[PDB]
Amino acid sequence: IPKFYADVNIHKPKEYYDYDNLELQWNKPNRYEIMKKIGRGKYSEVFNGYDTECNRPCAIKVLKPVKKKKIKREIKILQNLNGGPNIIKLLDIVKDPVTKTPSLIFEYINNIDFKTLYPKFTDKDIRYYIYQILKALDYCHSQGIMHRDVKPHNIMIDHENRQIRLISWGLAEFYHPGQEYNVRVASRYYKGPELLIDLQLYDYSLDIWSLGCMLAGMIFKKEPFFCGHDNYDQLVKIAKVLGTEDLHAYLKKYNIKLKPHYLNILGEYERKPWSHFLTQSNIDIAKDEVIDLIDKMLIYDHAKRIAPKEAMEHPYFREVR
Ligand SMILES: Nc1ncnc2c1ncn2[C@@H]1O[C@H](COP(=O)(O)OP(=O)(O)OP(=O)(O)O)[C@@H](O)[C@H]1O
Ligand SMILES: [Cl-]
């Protein structure tokens, strides 16, 4: 039972969540001037473009042959989240008349690779940007949607203009109590324990684990924070930090019995204190307020994790604007 926003979709009309019954009106791609390729996805290519009619830059996401089921969902979710704080705006959906290839037109964000940008950040910079990702996540959760793929790679930042956007809504899904969800989502490094132990009855809490992994990696200057060689090893990398005592307690509560594979590789680990991750290069940002915030997010028990709504109230953010 998610603390917040559990029954959002229950009180919403079927049209809101039934994305496969969505009638898409594809427009002519003529007005969008295609320029430099800025991104590469699993089943897409993102280009810097220009809306010649509305005097506006855009990011044109061309789509490789994927079932309409996947596109319709991404479109429905982006539509339902329009005007959300720090959520990428979908401006148009276009289809080539000849090739019949669909493309999604998004507002353009001048991003700099996090591997180049993040080291240039100050304590005040990470503070502000994490608050903004929390605002985005509190909005989509309130709209009955889980992002299911929060990672530094899906956060666009134009540092010069202090503009931040949560992108990649392709894996985003609607939360319905009692529904079993595909555990084979998110980057292995940002996959919550519920995905690793095959707990299909997960919720919004999944996004706080992923954001916790991101925040830990940023302030401890170690990305990916938990670096597993496989899905089974990823739980070991987690347990080697959070301790196995709280893991066994988590499995006993949700009555989950680990695979014949897990029992051998998983040892008995004591919880590593967050202080053991401090270095000369990171103590300046790895202060006591942020470590408390990380401690409240990286918790096995998805039901015991802090909500984005609550995280925003934390003293780490003293956001008097
Ligand atoms: N609006 C945008 N502004 C700037 N860059 C963008 C924008 N949208 C996408 N990109 C870039 O394109 C890359 C891939 O885009 P995106 O994450 O939306 O696709 P994807 O979901 O992985 O693709 P697919 O679902 O087809 O596999 C991003 O990592 C980013 O660098
Ligand atoms: Cl894997």
mmCIF file of C-alpha atoms and ligand atoms in Angstrom:
data_model
loop_
_atom_site.group_PDB
_atom_site.id
_atom_site.type_symbol
_atom_site.label_atom_id
_atom_site.label_comp_id
_atom_site.label_asym_id
_atom_site.label_seq_id
_atom_site.Cartn_x
_atom_site.Cartn_y
_atom_site.Cartn_z
ATOM 1 C CA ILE A 1 0.000 0.000 0.000
ATOM 2 C CA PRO A 2 1.993 3.079 -1.168
ATOM 3 C CA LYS A 3 1.832 5.799 1.614
ATOM 4 C CA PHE A 4 0.736 8.296 -1.046
ATOM 5 C CA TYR A 5 -1.067 8.292 -4.399
ATOM 6 C CA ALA A 6 -2.096 4.579 -4.274
ATOM 7 C CA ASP A 7 -5.699 5.012 -5.562
ATOM 8 C CA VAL A 8 -4.952 7.870 -8.094
ATOM 9 C CA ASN A 9 -5.928 5.778 -11.205
ATOM 10 C CA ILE A 10 -8.901 4.188 -9.363
ATOM 11 C CA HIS A 11 -10.690 7.594 -9.314
ATOM 12 C CA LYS A 12 -9.400 8.502 -12.825
ATOM 13 C CA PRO A 13 -11.556 7.618 -15.950
ATOM 14 C CA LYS A 14 -10.444 4.510 -17.969
ATOM 15 C CA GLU A 15 -9.411 6.887 -20.852
ATOM 16 C CA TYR A 16 -6.617 8.262 -18.579
ATOM 17 C CA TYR A 17 -4.811 4.881 -18.140
ATOM 18 C CA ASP A 18 -6.016 2.784 -21.117
ATOM 19 C CA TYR A 19 -3.247 3.789 -23.531
ATOM 20 C CA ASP A 20 -3.858 0.998 -26.057
ATOM 21 C CA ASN A 21 -7.302 2.488 -26.834
ATOM 22 C CA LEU A 22 -5.663 5.884 -27.589
ATOM 23 C CA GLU A 23 -6.348 7.371 -31.077
ATOM 24 C CA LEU A 24 -3.150 9.161 -32.211
ATOM 25 C CA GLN A 25 -3.296 12.100 -34.628
ATOM 26 C CA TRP A 26 0.044 12.063 -36.450
ATOM 27 C CA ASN A 27 1.078 15.353 -38.027
ATOM 28 C CA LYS A 28 3.179 16.246 -41.102
ATOM 29 C CA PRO A 29 6.947 16.472 -40.224
ATOM 30 C CA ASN A 30 7.590 19.286 -42.771
ATOM 31 C CA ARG A 31 7.928 22.204 -40.197
ATOM 32 C CA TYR A 32 10.710 20.474 -38.205
ATOM 33 C CA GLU A 33 14.186 21.166 -39.644
ATOM 34 C CA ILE A 34 16.358 18.065 -38.786
ATOM 35 C CA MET A 35 19.981 18.893 -37.749
ATOM 36 C CA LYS A 36 22.812 17.198 -35.636
ATOM 37 C CA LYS A 37 22.103 13.768 -34.015
ATOM 38 C CA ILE A 38 22.248 14.390 -30.269
ATOM 39 C CA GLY A 39 21.188 10.957 -28.940
ATOM 40 C CA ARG A 40 21.033 7.228 -29.580
ATOM 41 C CA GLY A 41 18.553 4.913 -27.891
ATOM 42 C CA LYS A 42 17.715 1.192 -27.985
ATOM 43 C CA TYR A 43 14.880 1.753 -30.526
ATOM 44 C CA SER A 44 15.314 5.505 -31.307
ATOM 45 C CA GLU A 45 17.612 8.300 -32.576
ATOM 46 C CA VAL A 46 17.332 11.833 -31.138
ATOM 47 C CA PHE A 47 18.248 14.879 -33.288
ATOM 48 C CA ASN A 48 18.523 18.593 -32.570
ATOM 49 C CA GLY A 49 15.802 20.241 -34.709
ATOM 50 C CA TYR A 50 13.901 23.495 -35.224
ATOM 51 C CA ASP A 51 10.164 24.202 -35.437
ATOM 52 C CA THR A 52 10.333 26.631 -38.430
ATOM 53 C CA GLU A 53 6.656 27.609 -37.816
ATOM 54 C CA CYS A 54 6.742 28.323 -34.050
ATOM 55 C CA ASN A 55 10.345 29.781 -33.903
ATOM 56 C CA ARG A 56 11.352 27.129 -31.371
ATOM 57 C CA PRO A 57 14.212 24.596 -30.931
ATOM 58 C CA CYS A 58 13.234 20.961 -30.471
ATOM 59 C CA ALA A 59 14.574 17.414 -29.981
ATOM 60 C CA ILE A 60 13.182 15.102 -32.730
ATOM 61 C CA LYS A 61 13.068 11.430 -31.475
ATOM 62 C CA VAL A 62 12.798 9.140 -34.540
ATOM 63 C CA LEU A 63 11.414 5.642 -33.726
ATOM 64 C CA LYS A 64 12.766 2.184 -34.872
ATOM 65 C CA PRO A 65 9.979 -0.468 -35.520
ATOM 66 C CA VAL A 66 8.378 -0.884 -32.047
ATOM 67 C CA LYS A 67 4.790 -2.075 -31.254
ATOM 68 C CA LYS A 68 2.252 0.826 -31.074
ATOM 69 C CA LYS A 69 1.560 -0.519 -27.500
ATOM 70 C CA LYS A 70 4.987 0.954 -26.402
ATOM 71 C CA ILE A 71 4.577 4.293 -28.332
ATOM 72 C CA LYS A 72 0.924 4.881 -27.245
ATOM 73 C CA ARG A 73 1.985 4.371 -23.582
ATOM 74 C CA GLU A 74 4.933 6.851 -23.823
ATOM 75 C CA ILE A 75 2.625 9.383 -25.618
ATOM 76 C CA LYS A 76 -0.246 8.912 -23.050
ATOM 77 C CA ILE A 77 2.171 9.321 -20.108
ATOM 78 C CA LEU A 78 3.836 12.462 -21.603
ATOM 79 C CA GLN A 79 0.407 13.908 -22.379
ATOM 80 C CA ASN A 80 -0.881 13.186 -18.786
ATOM 81 C CA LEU A 81 2.300 14.838 -17.347
ATOM 82 C CA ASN A 82 2.184 18.012 -19.539
ATOM 83 C CA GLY A 83 3.158 21.078 -17.475
ATOM 84 C CA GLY A 84 4.570 19.014 -14.637
ATOM 85 C CA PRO A 85 7.512 20.617 -12.814
ATOM 86 C CA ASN A 86 10.761 19.652 -14.642
ATOM 87 C CA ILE A 87 9.017 17.030 -16.854
ATOM 88 C CA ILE A 88 9.991 17.105 -20.606
ATOM 89 C CA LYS A 89 7.241 18.637 -22.772
ATOM 90 C CA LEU A 90 5.955 16.646 -25.805
ATOM 91 C CA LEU A 91 5.264 19.355 -28.411
ATOM 92 C CA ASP A 92 4.122 17.174 -31.324
ATOM 93 C CA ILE A 93 3.927 13.645 -32.784
ATOM 94 C CA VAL A 94 4.782 13.361 -36.497
ATOM 95 C CA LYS A 95 4.773 10.545 -39.081
ATOM 96 C CA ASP A 96 6.597 10.577 -42.477
ATOM 97 C CA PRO A 97 3.981 10.135 -45.262
ATOM 98 C CA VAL A 98 6.257 7.894 -47.434
ATOM 99 C CA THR A 99 8.281 5.779 -44.904
ATOM 100 C CA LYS A 100 5.359 5.892 -42.360
ATOM 101 C CA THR A 101 8.076 6.338 -39.618
ATOM 102 C CA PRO A 102 6.877 7.999 -36.432
ATOM 103 C CA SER A 103 8.780 10.715 -34.507
ATOM 104 C CA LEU A 104 8.119 12.464 -31.245
ATOM 105 C CA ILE A 105 8.931 16.198 -31.016
ATOM 106 C CA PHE A 106 10.072 17.356 -27.552
ATOM 107 C CA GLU A 107 11.161 20.735 -26.138
ATOM 108 C CA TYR A 108 14.967 20.996 -26.579
ATOM 109 C CA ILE A 109 17.266 20.963 -23.462
ATOM 110 C CA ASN A 110 20.948 21.823 -24.099
ATOM 111 C CA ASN A 111 22.465 18.943 -22.074
ATOM 112 C CA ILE A 112 26.154 18.312 -21.152
ATOM 113 C CA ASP A 113 27.117 14.623 -20.341
ATOM 114 C CA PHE A 114 26.796 14.094 -16.537
ATOM 115 C CA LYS A 115 30.318 12.617 -16.538
ATOM 116 C CA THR A 116 31.576 16.153 -17.581
ATOM 117 C CA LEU A 117 28.909 18.270 -15.814
ATOM 118 C CA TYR A 118 28.500 16.623 -12.376
ATOM 119 C CA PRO A 119 32.197 17.196 -11.321
ATOM 120 C CA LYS A 120 31.694 20.985 -12.020
ATOM 121 C CA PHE A 121 28.726 21.061 -9.519
ATOM 122 C CA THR A 122 28.944 22.715 -6.050
ATOM 123 C CA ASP A 123 27.137 21.575 -2.845
ATOM 124 C CA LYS A 124 24.447 24.218 -3.684
ATOM 125 C CA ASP A 125 24.162 22.898 -7.294
ATOM 126 C CA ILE A 126 23.438 19.194 -6.371
ATOM 127 C CA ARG A 127 21.066 20.535 -3.643
ATOM 128 C CA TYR A 128 18.975 22.474 -6.187
ATOM 129 C CA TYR A 129 18.977 19.858 -8.988
ATOM 130 C CA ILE A 130 18.019 16.939 -6.635
ATOM 131 C CA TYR A 131 15.116 19.051 -5.291
ATOM 132 C CA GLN A 132 13.924 19.548 -8.910
ATOM 133 C CA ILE A 133 14.045 15.777 -9.697
ATOM 134 C CA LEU A 134 12.043 15.198 -6.468
ATOM 135 C CA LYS A 135 9.421 17.799 -7.627
ATOM 136 C CA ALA A 136 9.143 15.942 -11.015
ATOM 137 C CA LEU A 137 8.781 12.525 -9.255
ATOM 138 C CA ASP A 138 6.249 13.870 -6.753
ATOM 139 C CA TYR A 139 4.198 15.179 -9.772
ATOM 140 C CA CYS A 140 4.161 11.950 -11.828
ATOM 141 C CA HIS A 141 3.405 9.865 -8.702
ATOM 142 C CA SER A 142 0.458 12.222 -7.931
ATOM 143 C CA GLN A 143 -0.666 11.515 -11.521
ATOM 144 C CA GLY A 144 -0.531 7.733 -10.807
ATOM 145 C CA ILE A 145 2.656 7.105 -12.860
ATOM 146 C CA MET A 146 6.024 5.434 -12.010
ATOM 147 C CA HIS A 147 9.043 6.527 -14.205
ATOM 148 C CA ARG A 148 10.733 3.116 -13.618
ATOM 149 C CA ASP A 149 14.090 4.288 -15.151
ATOM 150 C CA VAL A 150 15.503 7.121 -13.040
ATOM 151 C CA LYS A 151 19.279 7.438 -13.794
ATOM 152 C CA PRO A 152 21.681 10.373 -14.493
ATOM 153 C CA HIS A 153 21.297 9.470 -18.199
ATOM 154 C CA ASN A 154 17.570 10.344 -18.098
ATOM 155 C CA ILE A 155 18.090 13.767 -16.471
ATOM 156 C CA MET A 156 18.796 16.668 -18.888
ATOM 157 C CA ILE A 157 20.504 19.760 -17.412
ATOM 158 C CA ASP A 158 21.239 23.152 -19.098
ATOM 159 C CA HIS A 159 23.412 24.423 -16.187
ATOM 160 C CA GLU A 160 23.804 27.896 -17.822
ATOM 161 C CA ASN A 161 19.993 28.384 -17.595
ATOM 162 C CA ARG A 162 19.377 26.233 -14.423
ATOM 163 C CA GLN A 163 16.874 24.202 -16.507
ATOM 164 C CA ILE A 164 16.435 20.505 -15.663
ATOM 165 C CA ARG A 165 14.171 17.829 -17.219
ATOM 166 C CA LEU A 166 13.324 14.209 -16.416
ATOM 167 C CA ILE A 167 13.252 12.462 -19.868
ATOM 168 C CA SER A 168 12.866 8.865 -21.253
ATOM 169 C CA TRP A 169 9.202 8.079 -20.378
ATOM 170 C CA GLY A 170 9.348 4.899 -22.556
ATOM 171 C CA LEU A 171 9.534 2.515 -19.559
ATOM 172 C CA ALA A 172 7.088 4.625 -17.482
ATOM 173 C CA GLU A 173 3.932 2.718 -16.497
ATOM 174 C CA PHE A 174 0.695 3.546 -14.564
ATOM 175 C CA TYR A 175 0.307 2.381 -10.929
ATOM 176 C CA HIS A 176 -2.768 0.227 -10.149
ATOM 177 C CA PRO A 177 -2.954 -1.528 -6.716
ATOM 178 C CA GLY A 178 -2.562 -5.294 -7.040
ATOM 179 C CA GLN A 179 -1.101 -5.195 -10.531
ATOM 180 C CA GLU A 180 2.016 -7.289 -11.185
ATOM 181 C CA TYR A 181 4.685 -5.334 -13.098
ATOM 182 C CA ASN A 182 7.653 -6.394 -15.251
ATOM 183 C CA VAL A 183 10.782 -6.561 -12.995
ATOM 184 C CA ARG A 184 12.979 -6.346 -16.161
ATOM 185 C CA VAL A 185 13.065 -2.509 -16.153
ATOM 186 C CA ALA A 186 15.710 0.111 -15.172
ATOM 187 C CA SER A 187 19.536 -0.023 -15.408
ATOM 188 C CA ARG A 188 20.958 -2.927 -13.336
ATOM 189 C CA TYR A 189 22.873 -0.303 -11.294
ATOM 190 C CA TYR A 190 19.619 1.659 -10.496
ATOM 191 C CA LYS A 191 17.311 -1.453 -10.071
ATOM 192 C CA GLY A 192 15.732 -1.577 -6.612
ATOM 193 C CA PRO A 193 15.900 -4.799 -4.514
ATOM 194 C CA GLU A 194 12.203 -5.514 -5.402
ATOM 195 C CA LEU A 195 13.266 -5.876 -9.070
ATOM 196 C CA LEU A 196 16.259 -8.090 -8.118
ATOM 197 C CA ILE A 197 14.275 -10.462 -5.758
ATOM 198 C CA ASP A 198 11.453 -10.758 -8.421
ATOM 199 C CA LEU A 199 8.781 -8.858 -6.364
ATOM 200 C CA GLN A 200 6.365 -7.907 -9.196
ATOM 201 C CA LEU A 201 3.958 -5.997 -6.830
ATOM 202 C CA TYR A 202 6.110 -2.860 -6.743
ATOM 203 C CA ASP A 203 5.064 0.841 -6.784
ATOM 204 C CA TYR A 204 6.233 4.479 -6.963
ATOM 205 C CA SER A 205 8.871 3.635 -4.252
ATOM 206 C CA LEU A 206 11.045 2.170 -7.020
ATOM 207 C CA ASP A 207 11.904 5.698 -8.285
ATOM 208 C CA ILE A 208 13.206 6.739 -4.799
ATOM 209 C CA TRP A 209 15.644 3.771 -4.804
ATOM 210 C CA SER A 210 16.970 4.805 -8.258
ATOM 211 C CA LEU A 211 17.223 8.485 -7.157
ATOM 212 C CA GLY A 212 18.989 7.313 -3.976
ATOM 213 C CA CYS A 213 21.548 5.436 -6.116
ATOM 214 C CA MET A 214 21.991 8.625 -8.189
ATOM 215 C CA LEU A 215 22.378 10.941 -5.161
ATOM 216 C CA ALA A 216 24.828 8.443 -3.480
ATOM 217 C CA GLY A 217 26.903 8.281 -6.695
ATOM 218 C CA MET A 218 26.926 12.113 -7.031
ATOM 219 C CA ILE A 219 27.876 13.039 -3.436
ATOM 220 C CA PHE A 220 30.232 9.995 -2.820
ATOM 221 C CA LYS A 221 31.703 10.601 -6.349
ATOM 222 C CA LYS A 222 31.231 6.867 -7.276
ATOM 223 C CA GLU A 223 28.892 6.270 -10.278
ATOM 224 C CA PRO A 224 27.451 3.635 -10.599
ATOM 225 C CA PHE A 225 27.186 3.474 -6.791
ATOM 226 C CA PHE A 226 26.276 -0.268 -6.745
ATOM 227 C CA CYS A 227 28.234 -1.931 -9.650
ATOM 228 C CA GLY A 228 27.113 -5.588 -10.065
ATOM 229 C CA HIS A 229 28.526 -7.994 -12.729
ATOM 230 C CA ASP A 230 25.014 -9.589 -13.154
ATOM 231 C CA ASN A 231 21.482 -9.304 -11.664
ATOM 232 C CA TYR A 232 22.322 -11.723 -8.841
ATOM 233 C CA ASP A 233 25.615 -9.856 -8.138
ATOM 234 C CA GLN A 234 23.814 -6.504 -8.021
ATOM 235 C CA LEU A 235 21.876 -7.651 -4.895
ATOM 236 C CA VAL A 236 25.246 -8.725 -3.354
ATOM 237 C CA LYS A 237 26.783 -5.275 -4.149
ATOM 238 C CA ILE A 238 23.685 -3.753 -2.363
ATOM 239 C CA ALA A 239 23.795 -6.241 0.619
ATOM 240 C CA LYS A 240 27.561 -5.635 1.065
ATOM 241 C CA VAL A 241 26.505 -2.022 1.956
ATOM 242 C CA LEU A 242 22.996 -2.275 3.605
ATOM 243 C CA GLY A 243 23.724 -5.577 5.433
ATOM 244 C CA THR A 244 21.937 -8.900 5.031
ATOM 245 C CA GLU A 245 19.988 -8.676 8.407
ATOM 246 C CA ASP A 246 17.555 -6.064 6.955
ATOM 247 C CA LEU A 247 17.444 -8.127 3.677
ATOM 248 C CA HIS A 248 16.336 -11.345 5.391
ATOM 249 C CA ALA A 249 13.768 -9.324 7.363
ATOM 250 C CA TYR A 250 12.517 -7.814 4.014
ATOM 251 C CA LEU A 251 12.148 -11.243 2.369
ATOM 252 C CA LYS A 252 10.400 -12.724 5.470
ATOM 253 C CA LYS A 253 7.849 -9.764 5.501
ATOM 254 C CA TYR A 254 6.826 -9.950 1.804
ATOM 255 C CA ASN A 255 7.195 -13.796 1.949
ATOM 256 C CA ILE A 256 9.721 -13.955 -0.930
ATOM 257 C CA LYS A 257 11.957 -17.018 -1.208
ATOM 258 C CA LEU A 258 15.285 -16.414 -3.003
ATOM 259 C CA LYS A 259 16.288 -18.490 -6.097
ATOM 260 C CA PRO A 260 18.675 -21.563 -5.912
ATOM 261 C CA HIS A 261 21.283 -19.156 -7.448
ATOM 262 C CA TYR A 262 21.045 -16.450 -4.722
ATOM 263 C CA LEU A 263 21.620 -18.570 -1.532
ATOM 264 C CA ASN A 264 25.233 -19.509 -2.640
ATOM 265 C CA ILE A 265 26.527 -16.070 -3.825
ATOM 266 C CA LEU A 266 24.827 -14.123 -0.965
ATOM 267 C CA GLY A 267 26.960 -14.170 2.172
ATOM 268 C CA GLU A 268 26.256 -12.667 5.595
ATOM 269 C CA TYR A 269 27.257 -8.987 5.556
ATOM 270 C CA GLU A 270 27.199 -6.327 8.249
ATOM 271 C CA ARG A 271 25.840 -2.907 7.264
ATOM 272 C CA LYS A 272 28.645 -0.611 6.053
ATOM 273 C CA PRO A 273 28.259 2.873 7.631
ATOM 274 C CA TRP A 274 27.937 5.719 5.068
ATOM 275 C CA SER A 275 31.168 7.241 6.510
ATOM 276 C CA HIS A 276 33.199 4.402 4.928
ATOM 277 C CA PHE A 277 32.475 5.929 1.458
ATOM 278 C CA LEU A 278 34.119 9.289 2.341
ATOM 279 C CA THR A 279 37.334 10.286 0.487
ATOM 280 C CA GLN A 280 39.514 13.449 0.141
ATOM 281 C CA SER A 281 37.747 14.244 -3.143
ATOM 282 C CA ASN A 282 34.192 14.008 -1.750
ATOM 283 C CA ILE A 283 34.048 15.106 2.027
ATOM 284 C CA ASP A 284 33.364 18.753 0.844
ATOM 285 C CA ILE A 285 29.913 17.678 -0.565
ATOM 286 C CA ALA A 286 29.339 14.408 1.449
ATOM 287 C CA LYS A 287 28.049 16.326 4.532
ATOM 288 C CA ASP A 288 25.818 14.902 7.340
ATOM 289 C CA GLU A 289 22.465 16.348 5.966
ATOM 290 C CA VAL A 290 22.764 14.600 2.504
ATOM 291 C CA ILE A 291 23.996 11.287 4.108
ATOM 292 C CA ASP A 292 20.814 11.269 6.265
ATOM 293 C CA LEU A 293 18.748 11.866 3.086
ATOM 294 C CA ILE A 294 20.507 8.929 1.276
ATOM 295 C CA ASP A 295 19.923 6.701 4.404
ATOM 296 C CA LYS A 296 16.133 7.440 4.193
ATOM 297 C CA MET A 297 16.038 6.485 0.421
ATOM 298 C CA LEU A 298 18.357 3.430 0.130
ATOM 299 C CA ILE A 299 16.191 1.054 2.275
ATOM 300 C CA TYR A 300 15.281 -2.512 1.087
ATOM 301 C CA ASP A 301 11.678 -2.117 2.313
ATOM 302 C CA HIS A 302 10.009 -0.177 -0.464
ATOM 303 C CA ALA A 303 7.147 0.653 1.943
ATOM 304 C CA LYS A 304 9.640 2.209 4.477
ATOM 305 C CA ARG A 305 11.405 4.477 1.933
ATOM 306 C CA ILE A 306 10.917 8.266 2.096
ATOM 307 C CA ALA A 307 8.467 9.720 -0.430
ATOM 308 C CA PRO A 308 9.590 12.559 -2.811
ATOM 309 C CA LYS A 309 6.888 14.731 -1.080
ATOM 310 C CA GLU A 310 8.660 14.090 2.340
ATOM 311 C CA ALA A 311 12.258 14.244 0.942
ATOM 312 C CA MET A 312 11.522 17.822 -0.193
ATOM 313 C CA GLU A 313 10.714 18.715 3.436
ATOM 314 C CA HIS A 314 14.177 17.444 4.553
ATOM 315 C CA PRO A 315 16.605 20.056 6.101
ATOM 316 C CA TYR A 316 19.190 19.285 3.321
ATOM 317 C CA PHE A 317 17.015 21.530 1.094
ATOM 318 C CA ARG A 318 16.598 24.915 2.702
ATOM 319 C CA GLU A 319 14.566 26.095 -0.356
ATOM 320 C CA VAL A 320 13.285 29.572 0.518
ATOM 321 C CA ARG A 321 13.603 29.872 -3.360
HETATM 322 N N1 LIG B 1 14.528 16.825 -25.197
HETATM 323 C C1 LIG B 1 15.794 16.409 -25.256
HETATM 324 N N2 LIG B 1 16.779 17.330 -25.139
HETATM 325 C C2 LIG B 1 18.053 16.931 -25.254
HETATM 326 N N3 LIG B 1 18.530 15.703 -25.482
HETATM 327 C C3 LIG B 1 17.532 14.808 -25.579
HETATM 328 C C4 LIG B 1 16.173 15.067 -25.476
HETATM 329 N N4 LIG B 1 15.440 13.898 -25.610
HETATM 330 C C5 LIG B 1 16.355 12.976 -25.795
HETATM 331 N N5 LIG B 1 17.641 13.453 -25.784
HETATM 332 C C6 LIG B 1 18.889 12.702 -25.929
HETATM 333 O O1 LIG B 1 18.646 11.486 -26.614
HETATM 334 C C7 LIG B 1 19.036 10.362 -25.796
HETATM 335 C C8 LIG B 1 18.063 9.227 -25.998
HETATM 336 O O2 LIG B 1 16.718 9.726 -25.839
HETATM 337 P P1 LIG B 1 15.602 9.040 -24.918
HETATM 338 O O3 LIG B 1 16.109 8.706 -23.566
HETATM 339 O O4 LIG B 1 14.317 9.931 -24.825
HETATM 340 O O5 LIG B 1 15.314 7.724 -25.771
HETATM 341 P P2 LIG B 1 15.005 6.203 -25.421
HETATM 342 O O6 LIG B 1 13.824 6.115 -24.528
HETATM 343 O O7 LIG B 1 16.238 5.554 -24.765
HETATM 344 O O8 LIG B 1 14.697 5.469 -26.799
HETATM 345 P P3 LIG B 1 13.863 4.143 -27.096
HETATM 346 O O9 LIG B 1 12.687 4.146 -26.048
HETATM 347 O O10 LIG B 1 13.330 4.100 -28.487
HETATM 348 O O11 LIG B 1 14.852 2.968 -26.818
HETATM 349 C C9 LIG B 1 19.110 10.914 -24.378
HETATM 350 O O12 LIG B 1 19.954 10.134 -23.534
HETATM 351 C C10 LIG B 1 19.579 12.354 -24.610
HETATM 352 O O13 LIG B 1 20.984 12.504 -24.765
HETATM 353 CL CL CL B 2 21.465 -8.286 -16.317
#
